[PDB]
């Protein structure tokens, strides 16, 4: 219902898991080639745990710790509602990255070799002929990569001519603008 992974990567011969959830009993973990793991069903909230590796209590560095009145040091886990649905978990996770982005704005200040032009941008949709039998407003299907990009005709008379191909749902419109300058 509520799976929680307990994984030990630190190595050893035998690893046991103890915590508030099993009354500090030794739960033997199974090994893959390196990892010792256990997947338990835990309700939401705080859960205290500790690993027992080869006769010794071992601190998990990948998690926070808590210290009791009598000096017992245990690792601590938070099981949140957001942990049990991908998109909730992913939304929480991105928020932590955005929070980190803040710790590390439109303006008018200039900056303190440029990339080679993609050949695709030189396949000009308005330069290619379409064949006399079809409706003259029709065009071939555009490559997605040339959409939103600006094409122009050299200024002739006092007129600037501009065009671009834009998407509307699954259709494409190539607009031309005749603008005096």
């Amino acid at each position: 219902a509520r799976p929680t992974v307990f994984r030990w990567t630190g190595g050893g011969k035998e690893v046991y898991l103890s915590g508030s959830f099993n009354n500090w009993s030794k739960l033997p973990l199974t090994r893959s080639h390196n990892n010792f793991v256990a997947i338990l069903d835990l309700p939401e909230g705080e859960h205290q745990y500790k690993f027992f590796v080869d006769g010794q209590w071992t601190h998990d560095p990948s998690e926070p710790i808590v210290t009791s009145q009598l000096g017992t040091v245990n690792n601590i886990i938070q099981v949140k509602k957001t942990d049990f649905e991908v998109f909730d978990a992913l939304m929480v996770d991105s928020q932590k990255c955005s929070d980190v982005s803040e710790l590390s704005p439109y303006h008018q200040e200039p900056y303190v070799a440029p990339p080679i032009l993609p050949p695709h941008l030189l396949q000009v949709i308005l330069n290619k002929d379409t064949g006399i039998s079809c409706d003259p407003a029709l065009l071939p299907e555009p490559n997605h990569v040339m959409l939103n990009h600006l094409y122009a005709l050299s200024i002739k008379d006092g007129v600037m001519v501009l065009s671009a191909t834009h998407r509307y749902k699954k259709k494409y419109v190539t607009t031309l603008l005749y603008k005096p300058i």
């Binding site: 308005l126 409706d135 003259p136 407003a137 029709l138 065009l139 071939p140 299907e141 555009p142 008379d157 007129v159 191909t165 834009h166 509307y168 749902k169 699954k170 259709k171 494409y172 419109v173 190539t174 607009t175 031309l176 603008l177 005749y178 603008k179 005096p180």
Partner: protein, 300 residues
């Protein structure tokens, strides 16, 4: 099963009719109007939405009817320049044009039904309806009767065929059979333009002395005056004005009163023309059956 095409029209959005990829030419209203008509020719397009930069909105359309109106109003002689065609901006021609009456932008949303599109074309007596996205404010496409009828023909197999489809033109009475605006072989271009302006028809059958169709002068053919830059001589016969297409002209597309609605629709969709000339046994004009008459009948 009569409402089958009305129900079809009501179930389909304008979006369904828009090409996967198309070209749209826009003109800023401050553009010289002669430059606008040449830009229609160069881009191979008939109509262009009008963008008013100061208002930040689409205010209308520039069509071949705008060219017909400028030529007829301002042409004086082949010996004198048409100063206003050379001088006017779209902005100033429109002030002159729409001085007497009021006419705002007629447009449709890509999410509105084809029924609404047909209703707006007829109600507003137009041929070009711009599809404008309300979300982005962008004009996406210029919708026509040709486009709508061809989309309807693709789906006629998807539904039961109403009984009127197999009924003759005479029984159904679809089209105009009285006071048909026509021109003679010798009719000057200027006179023909006057007939478009007065009668607000989209094409004139060209007839011989006996009253038989020989050619057709459509509003589309007037753009050839801009293409060939022959607009300063409107004294030239309607025949001389049509000479440019004689090497690829298959003849006048016509129909008989005894022919069925389905036959006529099929003929029009295949031909990609706006109307057929209804003739008798000996090619004498008896009437007109236009896409606007057809759509009005189908979506009524």
């Amino acid at each position: 099963n009569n409402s089958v095409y009305t129900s079809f029209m009501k179930s389909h959005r304008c979006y369904d009719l828009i090409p996967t990829s198309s070209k749209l030419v826009v003109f800023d209203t401050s553009l010289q109007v002669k430059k606008a008509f040449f830009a229609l020719v160069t881009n191979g397009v008939r109509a262009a939405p009008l963008w008013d930069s100061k208002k930040q909105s689409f205010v209308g359309m520039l069509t071949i009817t705008d060219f017909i109106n400028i030529l007829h109003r301002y042409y004086k002689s082949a010996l004198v320049q048409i100063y206003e065609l050379e001088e006017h901006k779209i902005e100033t021609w429109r002030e002159v044009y729409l001085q007497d009456s009021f006419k705002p932008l007629v447009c449709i949303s890509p999410n509105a039904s084809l029924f609404d599109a047909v209703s707006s074309l007829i109600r507003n007596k137009i041929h070009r309806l711009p599809v404008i996205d309300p979300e982005s404010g962008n004009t996406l496409y210029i919708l026509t009767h040709k486009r709508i009828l061809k989309f309807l023909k693709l789906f006629i197999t998807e539904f039961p065929k109403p009984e009127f489809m197999s009924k003759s033109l005479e029984e159904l009475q679809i089209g105009t059979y009285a006071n048909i605006a026509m021109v003679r072989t010798t009719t000057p271009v200027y006179v023909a333009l006057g007939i478009f302006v007065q009668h607000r028809v989209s094409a004139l059958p060209v007839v011989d002395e006996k009253g038989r169709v020989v050619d057709i002068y459509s509003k589309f053919d007037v753009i050839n005056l801009a293409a060939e830059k022959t607009y300063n001589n409107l004294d030239v016969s309607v025949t001389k004005a049509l000479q440019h297409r004689s090497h690829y002209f298959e003849g006048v597309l016509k129909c008989y009163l005894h022919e069925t609605l389905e036959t006529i629709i099929n003929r029009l969709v295949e031909a990609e023309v706006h109307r057929l000339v209804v003739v008798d046994e000996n090619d004498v004009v008896k009437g007109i059956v236009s896409l606007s008459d057809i759509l009005q009948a189908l979506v009524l």
